[PDB]
Amino acid sequence: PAAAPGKNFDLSHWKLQLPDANTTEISSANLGLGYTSQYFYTDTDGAMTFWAPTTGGTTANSSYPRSELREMLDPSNSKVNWGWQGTHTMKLSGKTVQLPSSGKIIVAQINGIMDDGTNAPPLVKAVFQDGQLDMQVKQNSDGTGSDVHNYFTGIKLGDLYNMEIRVTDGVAYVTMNGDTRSVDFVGKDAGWKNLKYYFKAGNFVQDNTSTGGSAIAKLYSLSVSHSNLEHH
Template sequence: MHRSLLCLASLLLVAGCSHDEPGDYQSPADNYDLTHWKLTLPDDEASEVRSDELKGGYASRYFHLADNGAMVFMAPAGAGTTKNSDYPRAELRELLDPADDNRNWTGAGFHQLKASARVLRAPSTQKIVVGQIHGFDARPLIKLQWEKGKLKSLIKRHPKGSNKDISHVFATPVGNDLFSYVIEVQDGVLTVEVNGERIQHDFYKEDAAWREVPFYFKAGAYVQDDDEDGDDDVGEVQFTQLNVHHD
């Protein structure tokens, strides 16, 4: 199964708008296939936007189309959070079946998230997670974090029990420029690539308990800051490419 979410053949956009907040915003749905995603917002309730709402033209200050055709995610520091996190997010969550969150994929086979993005604004901590493989009722296998202008991978050794990370900082600084990343799994081996630099980790070998964990991809702006320090203390990320592939 292959899903390409980027379609920038034209910048002549006719997009739906949302009026739930002041201002008019263009919807990403005209440029991106959002069929297999739902969105978590950084509002007080950490609301979710279903895939049918995304396809129907949802847009807000938290999630909209930029004038250049990029998909924008924006999350203020100290905003609303999900029950299992201290940090706010404007973040897409992959859905193999848009009607069933319980259908996910395992570490067997081949699974790939490929993206290009840039961080336009960062919170005072200078930390934003821009991509993940998350375990269903388990920890994230991998978080890719923009931190002070560099990309860092944070790989969990175990789905439960010890909460230790394997961390790797990619050599090339990205600052606020466009960068590309690939996060993929093939038969229990995780590969992370940023701007051509690759690392690998055999998570099945690290802990056989990962074999029993279902997974899903996430992408967006997951701000690692629980304390708002002024109106400009926000994370804002633009995605210009976001593809998912499963075999």
């Protein structure tokens, strides 16, 4: 059989959040020891693959189920996260294979979090629909209001995509297939300076209906880097 995703990808700085009844989380170490299930597996094309049904368990402050990685700077402490200053970059390649009845899933994020671990709004959501990825960047740190939309069209269900999400000094740069857009979020709302952040990647299903079906998203490559000095 294929190597489990964490015995292939280096997942030593991710934990996995699942859509089972209990919304089980799989630790970095357990991922590295080969955790795999119906929700999380290496497919025949080598992809780390995330499956979640619309009927799945959901986290405390979301109505939607996920099979999704959550960045862990410290694999044993989810309260260790990064800030608006410096350069913080996630790069991935992936594809969305199957959608729920709503036709929408979220395949990558930056989630906000308070210093003490308390939940906060997402800053960036990569929303996939058949034919369109919308890289949404939240305007208000307090979670009110709406998002700035960044549309990348022509990306079909089953198409391989290359993505980057980068924060440098409170500006978000969102890229699909070499097309980069930028949103100055700290410039818009200084309150973002008060929040911390972490990356997410996987399958956050924007459908919780009993008859909604399920979704599958895939990752072929994945990297996160944090730096205090970037070179030309």
